[PDB]
């Protein structure tokens, strides 16, 4: 359970599940979720857009753009070994963690529920190759195989 309030959420999670949804319990929980929601989905925008009303704002904004470039380059989860069961690798600092598809569990999604029959392997991106030397139009380019 993510979101809601501890008592009702506890109630729910402690439900064995032998008969599926405890409708009462669930209801209670969902009212608590109205009281205390959790983030389900979102649209990101880069934090450097916020460096807007400070001394040297434009200088620090451009520095932090540069920074975020470098930082991505250095800590992108592309450099993780692929997670099993087409989980998503993520790189918190210097440890890669796997975010598991629903129907896969264990610390690194290593084992899968009876319903996860699908053996399809999703093609996560490789790391960007280095920028090529400037072409006949003075454009550099870089590519990631997706391999």
């Amino acid at each position: 359970i993510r979101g809601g309030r501890s008592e009702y959420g506890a109630a729910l999670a402690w439900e064995k599940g032998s008969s599926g949804l405890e409708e009462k319990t669930f209801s209670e929980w969902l009212e608590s979720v109205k009281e205390n929601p959790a983030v389900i989905d979102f649209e990101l925008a880069p934090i450097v857009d916020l460096v807007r009303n400070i001394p040297c704002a434009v200088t620090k904004r451009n520095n932090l753009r540069k920074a975020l470039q470098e930082y991505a380059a250095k800590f992108d989860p592309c450099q993780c070994a692929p997670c099993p069961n087409n989980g998503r690798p993520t790189l918190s600092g210097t440890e890669c963690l796997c975010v598991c598809q629903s129907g896969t569990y264990g610390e690194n999604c290593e084992k899968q529920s009876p319903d996860y029959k699908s053996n399809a392997v999703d093609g996560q991106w490789g790391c960007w190759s280095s920028w090529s030397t400037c072409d006949a139009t003075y454009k550099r380019s870089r590519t990631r195989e997706c391999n």
Binding site: S6, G9, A10, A38
Partner: protein, 50 residues
């Protein structure tokens, strides 16, 4: 044989600031103040102990 392995988290997280902006506790700062400024491992070990 039962196993129950069970967590409730309800402070989804705290994130402490970086060491620059953290405020040290008075007794901890006092113990840092009394560290000998030299590798007397007895003192630093008493620090890591507490």
């Amino acid at each position: 044989q039962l196993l129950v392995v069970e967590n409730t988290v309800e402070v989804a997280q705290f994130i402490n600031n970086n060491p620059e902006f953290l405020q040290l506790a008075e007794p901890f700062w006092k113990e840092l103040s009394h560290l000998p400024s030299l590798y007397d491992y007895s003192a630093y070990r008493r620090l890591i102990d507490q």
